[PDB]
Design a protein around this ligand. Sequence first.
Ligand SMILES: COc1ccc(Cl)c2c1C(=O)C(=O)N2
Ligand SMILES: [Zn+2]
Length: 140
Amino acid sequence: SGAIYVGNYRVVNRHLATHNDWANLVWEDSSRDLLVSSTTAQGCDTIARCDCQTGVYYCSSRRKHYPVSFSKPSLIFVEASEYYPARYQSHLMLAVGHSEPGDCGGILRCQHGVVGIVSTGGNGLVGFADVRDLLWLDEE
Ligand SMILES: COc1ccc(Cl)c2c1C(=O)C(=O)N2
Ligand SMILES: [Zn+2]
């Protein structure tokens, strides 16, 4: 589990979004596994605005923060899960690393701030949904 809190926005895995998130929906994309909802309280996270391909992510299944090299956001074939059929997920970044059930929502960060959230895993890889292209998270 996990979310990003920036301005009056909450960013979660679409597949983990709550009743309150869907009621207070700003924006969602099934193909990216993202949902953004409105919040009452101001958040403290900063979104990275960069093309960094190195960072640190939190892995809840190991209680550890791993330094990683990750691919640029791309269309990536993702095997069927309990949440989606086998499909192309867009704006996805891959790294060699641990990702198991309960790891989705872990934050990936670089020197500039939040890059994205754990969205996929298996076969010794971890996939992260990029948020750096969502410039509107910084305003309104
Ligand atoms: C599409 O959702 C997933 C696919 C693969 C893996 Cl390992 C996952 C998830 C999660 O939600 C999670 O916590 N671990
Ligand atoms: Zn960066």
